[PDB]
Design an enzyme around this catalytic site. Structure first.
Site, PDB file in Angstrom:
ATOM      1  N   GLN A 125      44.210  44.940  34.152  1.00  0.00           N
ATOM      2  CA  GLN A 125      43.184  45.853  33.712  1.00  0.00           C
ATOM      3  C   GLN A 125      43.621  47.240  34.067  1.00  0.00           C
ATOM      4  O   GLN A 125      43.860  47.514  35.209  1.00  0.00           O
ATOM      5  CB  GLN A 125      41.811  45.516  34.320  1.00  0.00           C
ATOM      6  CG  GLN A 125      41.250  44.310  33.582  1.00  0.00           C
ATOM      7  CD  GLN A 125      39.840  43.832  33.948  1.00  0.00           C
ATOM      8  OE1 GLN A 125      39.510  42.650  33.723  1.00  0.00           O
ATOM      9  NE2 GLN A 125      38.991  44.731  34.392  1.00  0.00           N
ATOM     10  N   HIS A 134      36.396  36.424  42.207  1.00  0.00           N
ATOM     11  CA  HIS A 134      36.458  35.410  41.106  1.00  0.00           C
ATOM     12  C   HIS A 134      36.681  34.024  41.730  1.00  0.00           C
ATOM     13  O   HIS A 134      37.631  33.324  41.399  1.00  0.00           O
ATOM     14  CB  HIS A 134      37.558  35.686  40.058  1.00  0.00           C
ATOM     15  CG  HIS A 134      37.388  36.970  39.240  1.00  0.00           C
ATOM     16  ND1 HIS A 134      38.444  37.578  38.628  1.00  0.00           N
ATOM     17  CD2 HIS A 134      36.273  37.693  38.898  1.00  0.00           C
ATOM     18  CE1 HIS A 134      37.988  38.673  37.973  1.00  0.00           C
ATOM     19  NE2 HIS A 134      36.675  38.743  38.148  1.00  0.00           N
ATOM     20  N   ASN A 184      39.301  37.016  34.139  1.00  0.00           N
ATOM     21  CA  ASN A 184      37.962  37.044  34.601  1.00  0.00           C
ATOM     22  C   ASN A 184      37.269  35.763  34.041  1.00  0.00           C
ATOM     23  O   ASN A 184      37.368  35.492  32.878  1.00  0.00           O
ATOM     24  CB  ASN A 184      37.237  38.275  34.091  1.00  0.00           C
ATOM     25  CG  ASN A 184      38.132  39.523  33.935  1.00  0.00           C
ATOM     26  OD1 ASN A 184      38.824  39.700  32.886  1.00  0.00           O
ATOM     27  ND2 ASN A 184      38.026  40.443  34.892  1.00  0.00           N
TER      28      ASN A 184
HETATM   29  C1  LIG Z   1      30.078  42.351  41.751  1.00  0.00           C
HETATM   30  C2  LIG Z   1      31.141  42.303  40.644  1.00  0.00           C
HETATM   31  C3  LIG Z   1      31.139  41.182  39.837  1.00  0.00           C
HETATM   32  C4  LIG Z   1      32.081  41.115  38.814  1.00  0.00           C
HETATM   33  C5  LIG Z   1      32.642  42.337  38.356  1.00  0.00           C
HETATM   34  C6  LIG Z   1      32.770  43.417  39.231  1.00  0.00           C
HETATM   35  C7  LIG Z   1      31.897  43.417  40.298  1.00  0.00           C
HETATM   36  C8  LIG Z   1      32.151  44.512  41.241  1.00  0.00           C
HETATM   37  N1  LIG Z   1      33.313  42.377  37.134  1.00  0.00           N
HETATM   38  C9  LIG Z   1      33.608  41.252  36.564  1.00  0.00           C
HETATM   39  C10 LIG Z   1      32.954  40.078  36.873  1.00  0.00           C
HETATM   40  N2  LIG Z   1      33.126  38.964  36.198  1.00  0.00           N
HETATM   41  C11 LIG Z   1      33.884  38.929  35.082  1.00  0.00           C
HETATM   42  O1  LIG Z   1      33.837  37.987  34.317  1.00  0.00           O
HETATM   43  N3  LIG Z   1      34.180  40.099  34.594  1.00  0.00           N
HETATM   44  C12 LIG Z   1      33.950  41.322  35.115  1.00  0.00           C
HETATM   45  O2  LIG Z   1      34.495  42.244  34.503  1.00  0.00           O
HETATM   46  N4  LIG Z   1      32.299  39.966  38.092  1.00  0.00           N
HETATM   47  C13 LIG Z   1      31.850  38.556  38.377  1.00  0.00           C
HETATM   48  C14 LIG Z   1      30.579  38.133  37.629  1.00  0.00           C
HETATM   49  O3  LIG Z   1      29.486  39.008  37.917  1.00  0.00           O
HETATM   50  C15 LIG Z   1      30.189  36.746  38.094  1.00  0.00           C
HETATM   51  O4  LIG Z   1      31.203  35.832  37.927  1.00  0.00           O
HETATM   52  C16 LIG Z   1      28.932  36.188  37.389  1.00  0.00           C
HETATM   53  O5  LIG Z   1      27.829  37.076  37.616  1.00  0.00           O
HETATM   54  C17 LIG Z   1      28.568  34.804  37.970  1.00  0.00           C
HETATM   55  O6  LIG Z   1      27.459  34.265  37.210  1.00  0.00           O
HETATM   56  P1  LIG Z   1      26.540  33.163  37.945  1.00  0.00           P
HETATM   57  O7  LIG Z   1      27.226  31.847  38.249  1.00  0.00           O
HETATM   58  O8  LIG Z   1      25.306  33.183  37.026  1.00  0.00           O
HETATM   59  O9  LIG Z   1      26.225  33.703  39.367  1.00  0.00           O
HETATM   60  P2  LIG Z   1      25.530  35.054  40.016  1.00  0.00           P
HETATM   61  O10 LIG Z   1      26.141  35.175  41.303  1.00  0.00           O
HETATM   62  O11 LIG Z   1      25.663  36.308  39.102  1.00  0.00           O
HETATM   63  O12 LIG Z   1      24.026  34.745  40.354  1.00  0.00           O
HETATM   64  C18 LIG Z   1      23.512  33.569  40.877  1.00  0.00           C
HETATM   65  C19 LIG Z   1      22.147  33.906  41.471  1.00  0.00           C
HETATM   66  O13 LIG Z   1      21.470  32.919  42.162  1.00  0.00           O
HETATM   67  C20 LIG Z   1      20.797  33.464  43.219  1.00  0.00           C
HETATM   68  N5  LIG Z   1      20.632  32.610  44.374  1.00  0.00           N
HETATM   69  C21 LIG Z   1      21.575  32.547  45.268  1.00  0.00           C
HETATM   70  N6  LIG Z   1      21.166  31.609  46.174  1.00  0.00           N
HETATM   71  C22 LIG Z   1      19.955  31.141  45.767  1.00  0.00           C
HETATM   72  C23 LIG Z   1      19.075  30.215  46.245  1.00  0.00           C
HETATM   73  N7  LIG Z   1      19.270  29.537  47.338  1.00  0.00           N
HETATM   74  N8  LIG Z   1      17.877  30.031  45.581  1.00  0.00           N
HETATM   75  C24 LIG Z   1      17.598  30.692  44.411  1.00  0.00           C
HETATM   76  N9  LIG Z   1      18.444  31.617  43.949  1.00  0.00           N
HETATM   77  C25 LIG Z   1      19.629  31.760  44.569  1.00  0.00           C
HETATM   78  C26 LIG Z   1      21.036  34.945  43.255  1.00  0.00           C
HETATM   79  O14 LIG Z   1      20.232  35.748  44.041  1.00  0.00           O
HETATM   80  C27 LIG Z   1      21.677  35.241  41.944  1.00  0.00           C
HETATM   81  O15 LIG Z   1      20.928  35.997  41.137  1.00  0.00           O
HETATM   82  O1  LIG Z   2      37.389  44.750  42.441  1.00  0.00           O
HETATM   83  C1  LIG Z   2      37.009  45.020  41.114  1.00  0.00           C
HETATM   84  C2  LIG Z   2      37.416  43.841  40.250  1.00  0.00           C
HETATM   85  O2  LIG Z   2      36.556  42.755  40.584  1.00  0.00           O
HETATM   86  C3  LIG Z   2      36.548  41.694  39.648  1.00  0.00           C
HETATM   87  O3  LIG Z   2      35.388  40.903  39.822  1.00  0.00           O
HETATM   88  C4  LIG Z   2      36.430  42.153  38.200  1.00  0.00           C
HETATM   89  O4  LIG Z   2      36.532  41.072  37.351  1.00  0.00           O
HETATM   90  C5  LIG Z   2      37.416  43.189  37.743  1.00  0.00           C
HETATM   91  F1  LIG Z   2      36.938  43.629  36.518  1.00  0.00           F
HETATM   92  C6  LIG Z   2      37.442  44.317  38.760  1.00  0.00           C
HETATM   93  O5  LIG Z   2      36.371  45.164  38.515  1.00  0.00           O
END
Ligand SMILES: *Cc1cc2c(cc1C)Nc1c([nH]c(=O)[nH]c1=O)N2C[C@H](O)[C@H](O)[C@H](O)COP(=O)(O)OP(=O)(O)OC[C@H]1O[C@@H](n2cnc3c(N)ncnc32)[C@H](O)[C@@H]1O
Ligand SMILES: OC[C@H]1O[C@@H](O)[C@H](O)[C@@H](F)[C@H]1O
Ligand SMILES: *Cc1cc2c(cc1C)Nc1c([nH]c(=O)[nH]c1=O)N2C[C@H](O)[C@H](O)[C@H](O)COP(=O)(O)OP(=O)(O)OC[C@H]1O[C@@H](n2cnc3c(N)ncnc32)[C@H](O)[C@@H]1O
Ligand SMILES: *Cc1cc2c(cc1C)Nc1c([nH]c(=O)[nH]c1=O)N2C[C@H](O)[C@H](O)[C@H](O)COP(=O)(O)OP(=O)(O)OC[C@H]1O[C@@H](n2cnc3c(N)ncnc32)[C@H](O)[C@@H]1O
Ligand SMILES: OC[C@H]1O[C@@H](O)[C@H](O)[C@@H](F)[C@H]1O
EC number: 1.1.3.10
Lengths: 576, 576, 90, 90
Positions: free
Chosen positions: A406, A506, A551
């Site tokens: 990226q 990831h 990703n």
């Molecule tokens: C923080 C971050 C994340 C990513 C990017 C950059 C930054 C700084 N950029 C990136 C990402 N992914 C990619 O594909 N491309 C990008 O360019 N990041 C990762 C991405 O954000 C994650 O992989 C994705 O959200 C994961 O989806 P998910 O499996 O739906 O999981 P989440 O973590 O988003 O949310 C789960 C969720 O459940 C809750 N939670 C946690 N524990 C509990 C319990 N015990 N009970 C009920 N709920 C629970 C949370 O609070 C949360 O909302």
């Molecule tokens: O540390 C930042 C990186 O973190 C990963 O989760 C993201 O997928 C990349 F796009 C990059 O933003």
């Protein structure tokens, strides 16, 4: 709140939203529980970057990201502070303090792993990069028929792309983006192909991009409502899911135990189907708290009852990063088509171009933007316009360069933010390496220490595996160094480096998918169904069992989609 | 959105909201425009600290603050980066880069000054300290009648306190709070008085405080609705108000010019009454952009037509900060009342105390807490419970100590937070000094350079006045050192220091109030009305014309209340 | 060439630092705006601590330095003595 | 001649230093000159530089040189945090 639902989904990230969109769509009575709260405005679980102020002050968004990343596991701190006043209280040991995890070995941690607890999950802050995996990175959804496997993937991916609004056009008119993309293309002709990063985003205006999020998948509004009078959906935020209850035969889930964080009350929720999409780490914790896998420090002599692989074979990708300052040659090339006469700041100064000329190196829109910037801001030494958007360039994983790249400006910056060198000149480089699944690499949970939600504390035992994983990782570093020198030199303060293990976020394979529980060392089948269990399903990155560089979120969406097909074939919605 | 309203308010901070509560309630058709957006969650304009996640992870909230504080004026950077690659583009001069202001003298700046563009304004992140000003800090609302003056102020302050829900007992059962309060009380018995900082907050449970915000004053929900069928209020976020149009005669505003940031269109909104509560800097910007005061570098030789005091006599407080690590003595004294048996960690350990013994140095609620912490956490060497609230202590401004003190734990931390020393031991100290108003201390706006909203760039010409202000700021410094030493020694990494001028965000006097335009060198009268104009009102700290040490917001709300009485008397709402 | 330096090689950098004096240091324009209000405070960036007002900070050799001791820089140098090939040789 | 605080976390037996030195084209525009006003510590004319690495070959080789160190060093080891690849002060 009801006692009884067709489906309950734990977590409101973009994966739980994929289940909801699909199931609320087919007329199921759905409830979703999130531990975190609504805080993205009136579009529930929308992207926090979609405000005019953030997209005008893009250096500030890093504080949002940091404000919602809570470190998974922090070893006990052994820094020596020996300049306290002799009157001050001190301890004679490095005791457990400030929430640190005494089970965690500082030298086999993913010190950078973090989690987010907010409705919309990490999708409220994420970078929106949504590339497809090619075959080498991708789980088989069909043995022995590569074309049928191909066919199934492409159908899922295209649908997943439509939920996210993935496109590869949103930066096409940025000078900076095309500057970099064109030079990389020229410099690698044939040998590597470059393109815009595929992005889940829509451009609203030259200065504004609507970044996608879990809200884009499904708007998370309760139903029935005027727009879907026939649909049934309730989101309960501030609700921690603690445990699924297994039946005696380990063939069915019987309830979900929850805790209302505001009232403090505790409930047991009945559903036909239980979908867990709480993150690759918290899905695991939820399961282990419910008697799956093994609480406590791994012990082989005590072989677990259910899901022996749960929390083993974890993968996290290697990340190397640097920033460059554009070369003089490249900055001078921006104005290559222009005739510049006289002295800037004087009334005799002009800057012109010849539209349409086939010897012009740039299209007219580029030359028009440069011309205008140069004529209205004669005091600035750069041909680049002030509101020019960042680059968003990738060369995708291939066998010959088995890493993801990226190249642009990421909102998640790592150090103090540099002010001496003009931003227009700065390019980000991020190369992501694939990591071999190995049983020894583990996420496990204390039986004695607990988190801030009184759940078992996660603890990592991880090292990047020797062999291919380490070789590719340093070959990746070298590649970044080589490729980036094509654009310019390194920015002081952002010199080439590996980032902290897990900062990249990831994490995969914590509840990994396979055809065969035993033969393939895994926890869910290719419908994302937990082995043994009729009615329990896991979604997210935790499912991916292969070594990937790109990703993952797209792919995990694609799996959720095929999970929802299975649900629709096996469970009948209750009559409205 | 209509073309006409009875009242239009610019800015949705807590002053804006004070005007709204008064005029909506009294039946005026009101519209409020904010350049920022609703982000905060379903309670519009509510405090961002009010989530379960931030109250368990209080050290993260600094990230929310930093994230919505945009520097007002950054001088041109002159740092030498001379380790760029020789291929990289290199500046020949220190040119204007990264939005910097070439008008700004870096040596006469309020570099820590910043602004926040979100609905609810800065009250989405503030610390909620709401003291009264005493006479010596307060502007006169009544001439030649000290007791009439005190009476009117007491009346207004009481009302403001109810609006914000100010209290002084939210931290009454915190061991830390009381530990520090008691030691200070004792060490200065008969010399100074110590109490809880008056806080705009309501305690909901032992681990959760609902901090007040603009939302507390007014919920910002459009009216009419079910809860209020005869009110009329609309909030239009993402709208930049750019100009109030003066009539040629300079006696009336005829319209407000706005810029809708989402569609990109511009409109002219009419009202009967116009209220500016955009914040000290931005009320001044908006007026100077509409013809009041003088645009550009100040020039005596040319006199302003209107409001020649605008942007002069500005005041910002000096701020001195440190952190301390609690003395061995004070920590030992926490368990003074306990009888301890056995050895920690075994079935034999017992910790007990006798409720009501008058040998006891502490109360029952304290001993019970310590007891239960020490029995349930026998590994821990500290007898302070884990979730014990932070101290919230002040000795208010007096003639012999003419500075405001806040002692405790602020969310606005100013270095990376250390993890070596246990958080329960650390106490913050912040002493706020008063600054004499001087004509030469100035906020002005450039006639060429613009900010990111394409409005005139703000520029400061400021130095803490010599004489009393400087003498006191240094005396303050010393007192902090003397006082803090009674609680413990300094924490390394937080030694006693002055903060960056303007970092405290308590700017006032930019559009200051007085009885007569000339004698008092001011811009508004005591109804907050702009001199010369029938129908233009200013709210906020920019109105406060005196030298003050304490947090200004309650005082500025007080003013707005008084302003609303005038409005209510002198304008009639349109029929419903 | 002392036993103490050859057993503590990490410390020798201090000897070098001790005798390298900067040739031309530009006038400093670092902003320190956290002085006490009672402290004497510059109105301009004036010529301080032996800096050179002739020197453009952006066209300097800032790392340049000289040594004034008997033996000159040979009292501290790394002792690397390669020959030049023709390409580098007058 | 180490350039920062000597790190102590990594066994110094493991640490290898890399330094690559590039050649610079002589250009009349690159000069050391002496003030006729300002004087140094011994009352002699203050030295001043007007210097930039020349565009062209000097620049292209500089950056090719930096890549060669990266590429070569990686045969032996990855970079030591705190001593990542950098150009040093001219
Ligand atoms: C923080 C971050 C994340 C990513 C990017 C950059 C930054 C700084 N950029 C990136 C990402 N992914 C990619 O594909 N491309 C990008 O360019 N990041 C990762 C991405 O954000 C994650 O992989 C994705 O959200 C994961 O989806 P998910 O499996 O739906 O999981 P989440 O973590 O988003 O949310 C789960 C969720 O459940 C809750 N939670 C946690 N524990 C509990 C319990 N015990 N009970 C009920 N709920 C629970 C949370 O609070 C949360 O909302
Ligand atoms: O540390 C930042 C990186 O973190 C990963 O989760 C993201 O997928 C990349 F796009 C990059 O933003
Ligand atoms: C950031 C902060 C502030 C305070 C504390 C802590 C820190 C970290 N602590 C606190 C303070 N005040 C006290 O009285 N007690 C203390 O504990 N802080 C300061 C306090 O927050 C402010 O004094 C107060 O909000 C000021 O209220 P206001 O006059 O209504 O000002 P706001 O800045 O809150 O909001 C105005 C507003 O209007 C907008 N705006 C600006 N320009 C325009 C234009 N051109 N058009 C439309 N709207 C505009 C903003 O978006 C903003 O919301
Ligand atoms: C400091 C240093 C130097 C070198 C290496 C390591 C480091 C940290 N490593 C290096 C050296 N060169 C190599 O070829 N290979 C290496 O491994 N370094 C450079 C080398 O040190 C110099 O090239 C060499 O000494 C230069 O010798 P010189 O031409 O004899 O010059 P010196 O500076 O050594 O001595 C001059 C000398 O004259 C004096 N002086 C200065 N001004 C006056 C005036 N006005 N009057 C009288 N005398 C004057 C000095 O005090 C000094 O003794
Ligand atoms: O800098 C931290 C301080 O910030 C000011 O704005 C507040 O009024 C103080 F209460 C304290 O929070």
């Amino acid at each position: 709140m009801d006692i009884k639902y067709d489906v309950v989904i734990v977590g409101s990230g973009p994966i739980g939203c994929t289940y909801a969109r699909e199931l609320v769509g087919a007329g199921y009575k759905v409830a979703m529980f999130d531990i975190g709260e609504i805080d993205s405005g009136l579009k529930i679980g929308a992207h926090k970057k979609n405000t005019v102020e953030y997209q005008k002050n893009i250096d500030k968004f890093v504080n949002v990201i940091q404000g919602q990343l809570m470190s998974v596991s922090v070893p006990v701190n052994t820094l020596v502070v020996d300049t306290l006043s002799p009157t001050s209280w001190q301890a004679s040991t490095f005791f457990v303090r400030n929430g640190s995890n005494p089970e965690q070995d500082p030298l086999r941690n993913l010190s950078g792993q973090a989690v987010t607890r907010v409705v919309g999950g990490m999708s409220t802050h994420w970078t929106c990069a949504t590339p497809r995996f090619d075959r080498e990175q991708r789980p088989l959804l069909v043995k022995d028929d590569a074309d049928a496997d191909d066919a199934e993937w492409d159908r899922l991916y295209t649908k997943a792309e439509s939920y996210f609004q993935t496109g590869t056009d949103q930066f096409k008119e940025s000078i900076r983006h095309n500057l970099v993309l064109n030079k990389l293309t020229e410099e690698y002709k044939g040998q590597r192909d470059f393109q815009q990063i595929p992005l889940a985003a829509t451009r609203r205006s030259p200065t504004f991009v609507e970044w996608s999020s879990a809200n884009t998948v499904f708007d998370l509004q309760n139903r029935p409502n005027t727009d879907a009078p026939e649909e049934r959906f309730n989101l309960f935020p501030a609700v921690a899911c603690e445990r699924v209850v297994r039946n005696a035969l380990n063939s069915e889930i019987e309830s979900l135990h929850i805790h209302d964080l505001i009232s403090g009350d505790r409930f047991e929720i009945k559903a036909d189907v239980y979908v867990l999409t709480a993150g690759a780490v918290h899905n695991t914790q939820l399961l282990v708290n419910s008697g799956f896998g093994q609480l406590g420090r791994p012990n082989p002599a005590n072989p677990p009852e259910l899901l022996p692989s749960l929390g083993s074979y974890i993968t996290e990708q290697s990340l190397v990063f640097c920033q460059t300052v554009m070369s003089t040659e490249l900055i001078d090339s921006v104005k290559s088509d222009m005739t510049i006469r006289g002295t800037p700041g004087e009334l005799t100064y002009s800057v012109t171009y010849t539209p349409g000329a086939s010897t012009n190196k740039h299209p007219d829109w580029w030359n028009e933007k440069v011309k205008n910037h140069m004529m209205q801001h004669q005091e600035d030494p750069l041909p680049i316009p002030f509101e020019d958007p960042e680059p968003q360039v990738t060369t995708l994983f291939q066998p010959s360069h088995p890493w993801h790249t990226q190249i642009g400006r990421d909102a998640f910056s790592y150090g103090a933010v540099q002010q001496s060198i003009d931003s227009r000149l700065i390019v980000d480089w991020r190369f992501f390496g694939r990591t071999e699944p190995k049983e020894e690499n583990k996420l496990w949970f204390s039986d004695k220490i607990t988190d801030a939600y009184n759940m078992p504390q996660p603890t990592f035992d991880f090292r990047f595996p020797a062999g291919r994983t380490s070789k590719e990782a340093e070959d990746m570093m070298t590649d970044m160094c080589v490729m980036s020198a094509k654009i310019g030199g390194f920015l002081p303060g952002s010199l080439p480096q590996f980032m902290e293990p897990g900062l990249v976020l990831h994490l995969g394979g914590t509840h990994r998918m396979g055809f065969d529980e035993k033969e393939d060392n895994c926890c869910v089948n290719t419908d994302s169904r937990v082995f043994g269990f009729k009615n329990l399903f896991l979604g997210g990155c935790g499912n991916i069992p292969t070594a990937y560089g790109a990703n993952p979120t797209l792919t995990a969406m694609s799996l959720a989609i095929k999970s929802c097909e299975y649900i629709k074939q096996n469970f009948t919605p209750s009559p409205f």
